[PDB]
Design a protein around this ligand. Structure first.
Ligand code: FA6
Ligand code: FA6
Ligand code: FA6
Ligand code: FA6
Ligand code: FA6
Ligand code: FA6
Ligand code: FA6
Ligand code: FA6
Ligand code: FA6
Ligand code: FA6
Ligand code: FA6
Ligand code: FA6
Lengths: 137, 137, 137, 137, 137, 137, 137, 137, 137, 137, 137, 137
């Protein structure tokens, strides 16, 4: 199927003063998706409720999700539970290597329900997640 | 007093694809409340802030609350603290038996401040909570 | 610099039925700030996303922050991460002595990134935080 | 006919700090109406213009009105004139015995155009007004 | 000057079920004004505050006012006081002969500050008020 | 307590064409309040319903009120009744000496429930009311 | 009575690229109405629901209607039924001679309930409909 | 299941000047539904698009529908097609006996896809449709 | 010219529960358009008035239209008439073979004014319509 | 053609404290237009963008324009360029004799593209511009 | 009089990346005003129309204005003309020494109508303008 | 970097009646950008303030700008000053050869601060500006 949802959570709108901005990340993702024959829909919110609604829509549409949940990765049971309804693949992405950072960042509520997880590969992590989904149609 | 607040948290709007829908649950609750001589006000949100506001209103009105907080049961100190202001009974309800599921679901921030807790009895749990409140006027 | 942000999180709007109201707290802070030659901007929200936006603005303006995050003190990685972007001082304040209360309240995601922390001194804690910032220009 | 309008004027939203709240009053009225085979539509406003619009709608629908106009009972010719257009019964209700209070409260612009008046019987006054209308179909 | 304000108060929107409707009254006034070389601006509200704002605008513009205040004729000091600021003529109009009706309708807060008063001549009263203003330029 | 509410009713927005404007009056009040160690919150409306809501808020906050109700002084039972709920002092102020004017202005629905009344001292009346409240803490 | 409603349906906003524009048509109608001692209220919509609401208002006001329903002439039972409630005359107008065009345009749901019908006389058809209504008062 | 949707189309808001009003019809339906152990959700629109959305929601919820489509009964393929998605029963209702009226009213796009059809039994037709659905659970 | 409008009418938003969703259809169209050197603007509405406005815009821009009008294909003269203003090609598309279905679906108000018509080729019908327009520049 | 646009730019809303107000000017223009068999549409804005939009509409409608651009007369190339699209006459009007004032006011970006220019004849300048257009049909 | 308007034009919201921010400038001005016994109202816009409205309000209130018009200093006749209506002092301020910069910045439309002008003294220029107005009451 | 801003000023929305429309220009730019590996964000406004905000965003994002400012090219110091904050390249584009037209069009406030300028090459000028930026990364 063509459509892949890329959903970014809290503080990811701040990319590029936290070099690559979130707008630039959207552009990079869109270009790579077109190359792969996909259509990427990229969304970012600091609101858990908004993220939940986007995940609910992806469940109702049976669309795959690439999710970088920011701080809610480590803290939100609610976001996990929304993701548990997804029928298509869920790929967890983090820009930083969360396993090399504070202890609290080494625990994810999403990893057990995700198909797979990419961390520490920068923004290329998103592009690699897209290529997985393209080669897994 | 006639009025009981029934407040549902994250992902409870998704009932009936997660058979009984949330609209149907509202109908069942309303019917049982009328039978018991009560009026039930049933509300659902995926927003912690919205849930907090509803709990604040119930505190200011000295109205009892039946609360199924969804994932925030396990995670939100803020929701607990809002519930601590309530003067009337607080009944915690979960549809599933949270004690039979993942370890993280066996811990609730609400149970220590609730009057009581019903889990694992399905949607009938709400109806049983209503009957407690009716027989405790 | 003149401006200091005072940001209150969940349930702090309920001060004075939880004697001093939040409006009164704003007045007290404003008066003390004028005495110190500062301008205080006091804001309160029960919404994590709203708190994040206010912290983002303070980062972009290089303004100091006095933050009483309420229940999110103990639970929100996202709020921590927003505060990590601040270049000016961050002073954590709690009205109650959180170290004398439930175990879960003795852990803060903010303390490790804050300049300093004041707890248990009541509403005067805010005024003392302001005086620190004034004497540290 | 099934429908009865119950219209409350200024300060009646403050019931229960001025024990029974306005929400509770609505619940009590609704329950009694169902028992009587009626449907009660209960509305409250501190705005004369809003009350006038509700009375205008009841005139256009030929629906009966139970009206507790609050302070406007004693002061508003405009509200009287709107009520003069009603074709169905108008029942004036006051919770307090207005004849036992200040002199200005013993004069009503509505009493001369009302079918009848109940005062001093508490919130039961509304329920008794409903029973009149039910037995007068 | 060309412009005359015609301002109708409470219950005057109900003309023609209380034969001529308020829309028809506007049409009649507009036609007569054009014949007289004037421009009539006709407005109606059940809101005292709205009437006050229209009178305030006419004061700031030094425009004459034809005012049929409905029930507020007999009751509103506030409307009187707004009219006291007018520099151009104020003509009070009532469709019915208020002196032939209930005692309370025979007292007007506006008559002492009006240039003159027309009552009991029907809707033609407005047209006669316009002709006064035209012949008094 | 720091906060005092100053509430102006109908036509008081027109000050300074009815020299000192309402904006200027707000400035004068704010300055005097700061001198006295108070915070003044000054509001004006031509809407009775809006005034009622502001008085309701002051009742719920146990804050004192300085009220110049304009024409509603003489006419509104509803405004009186809202003021009767206040627990802190109510000071009635009029700029003009109402006892030297028309007979209808010599009767107030508010005076019997007010702590005290200042009339005829101009805009300084407000400043004197503030000084009373400051010396009565 | 002065008021006549002129109601245009789908595609009539496109006049003057489909020479005379709809704005110009409104102007022509208004001028002719003034000459005849009438007031014309001219409205156009591509929305059936909006047309229905305008017809409902004309029924409640007992005002005559000149209706050029565009394509809905041939297709809408709902519009017919709304027009059946009118007590004053209904004049059907079409700019083009619908009887000289496609077969489907030679059938109207409105003609059987209209007083009369004018087709093929251009925009003058509206002006002639107005003159009928003026001479039939 | 408890919930039944009752959907009324064009001109059904005009009931009771076209004796029983639409508000009264809602009341009658609600009462009968409660007696039968159901919950009725009654909606009316003159907009085809709005009716389509309500039918779409009933399809997604697998809820039964009682539909009186007004004039669109005879004309709308789109409404038919929306109803074809319903999995629960569809009961077509008309207040009037459409088979005794104009020829065009004797053809329905909905009858072939409806479970059954009630016509000519007045407003009781709705109540009888509800009783069918209750006895067919 | 680059731009082609693809306009879908009633019930086409329901694709993929009526496998391919409307979002997916948009993606497929966009990709094929880019391959052909075109830009496709894809819009869907259940509102006739909205469809009319989109067709009006395409007329004013002299842009070609691919139109799948859903049920309005068979019923709307208004939509036909809007399409008659188009100067660029109009291609009618239906996913299903309408000639193999109910008799009423074998009649189209659009076919006589369309350049051409594709039916029964699924969603590929849209892509084939795009390729026609690209090879006809 | 009947319609003439009269467009006023910055500071022209302030007429009558800068005797005749802008409202009065509108009235005078409307009356003169009716006498001449025209319809005048009079608009005023302090926003260049708003003026541009009004000129764009007049270009699309092939309607004549009487333009008093205020200060933008001397400064705005953008307004000139919008006026260059007009096909019907453009008449430039100024109330004051701009040639007798500061040097900067003696240069207009509009005069070279206008049909003609009237200055220094007061508000009658507009009426004379209207009479030109009427006699030039 | 207490009130002074401080109005900033285009690009002045960008202060502190173009050290002192606009928020900080507001704070500095407010503090200095309080010291001088004044109340400063500080506003900034990139919209000429918005600046014009603020100047219009200051004219109607007979309040003094400190104006740093940004680029419109050199270009806007409209802003000049609005300022010409002011009866109280107008003080022109620029942060930079405009006489040391490009030739076009050495010409101001405002200087000839201003009381006086301060340039090149930084943000202190505003504070010095305030002190002028305070010593000139 | 991928993103380039293309910003069009006054009257550029009117392209294609002033053959290629603004929508078509957007399409052409988008296609060329994709070919070059860029993402173009194309915006048009007749509002100087809106253009300023878009330039401010591009400054904060360190994104390059292709700017065709329309008439403001020749007149706006404010727009120049906003562009002076840009750190990435600024390319000035005009469709027409401004040096062959009126004298006032041969002067630009933007040229001295732009990297470079393209005029007179039609809409291809934008595409050539994009190719510069792509080859200058
Ligand atoms: O490295 C990442 O992508 C992160 O998701 C960014 C975060 N917030 O935006 C973190 O909280 C996190 O642990 C890692
Ligand atoms: O079983 C329940 O009712 C739950 O509250 C549902 C949840 N979210 O909606 C859970 O997160 C939960 O643990 C149990
Ligand atoms: O004592 C405080 O100031 C607290 O921040 C208040 C809280 N919510 O408003 C707490 O959750 C907390 O632990 C302490
Ligand atoms: O007793 C009552 O019900 C009253 O209507 C309440 C009032 N306001 O809410 C009064 O002003 C009144 O006289 C009595
Ligand atoms: O006769 C009139 O015109 C009146 O103003 C109508 C009223 N309300 O609309 C009255 O209250 C009145 O006394 C007379
Ligand atoms: O003198 C005053 O302050 C007054 O309150 C002003 C009024 N309206 O604004 C009056 O109606 C009044 O009697 C006195
Ligand atoms: O000729 C007319 O006036 C028409 O009503 C115009 C139409 N739409 O605007 C038609 O559909 C029609 O048949 C005739
Ligand atoms: O009799 C009915 O219920 C009808 O549905 C009412 C209609 N519109 O509201 C008709 O168009 C119809 O044929 C019958
Ligand atoms: O097959 C199609 O594409 C159709 O247009 C779909 C419809 N509604 O969405 C029909 O009403 C139709 O006849 C065919
Ligand atoms: O005299 C006029 O009509 C003017 O257009 C008024 C102005 N602004 O409203 C001027 O700027 C002008 O030069 C003349
Ligand atoms: O130096 C100043 O304060 C200026 O007003 C700032 C400007 N825009 O914000 C200029 O255009 C200017 O010439 C000087
Ligand atoms: O030729 C161009 O692109 C121009 O920028 C268009 C204009 N407005 O849209 C002009 O004012 C201009 O001089 C040239």
């Amino acid at each position: 199927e063509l459509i892949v949802n890329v959903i970014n959570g809290p503080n990811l709108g701040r990319l590029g003063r936290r070099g690559t901005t979130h707008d630039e990340l959207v552009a990079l993702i869109e270009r790579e998706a077109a190359e792969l024959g996909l259509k990427a829909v990229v969304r970012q919110s600091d609101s858990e409720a908004q993220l939940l609604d986007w995940i609910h829509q992806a469940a109702d549409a049976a669309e795959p999700v690439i999710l970088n949940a920011g701080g809610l990765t480590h803290t939100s049971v609610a976001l996990r539970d929304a993701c548990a309804e997804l029928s298509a693949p869920l790929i967890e992405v983090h820009i930083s290597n969360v396993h090399a950072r504070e202890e609290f960042r080494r625990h994810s509520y999403l990893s057990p329900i995700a198909t797979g997880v990419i961390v520490g590969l920068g923004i290329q992590g998103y592009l690699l997640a897209l290529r997985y989904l393209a080669e897994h149609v």
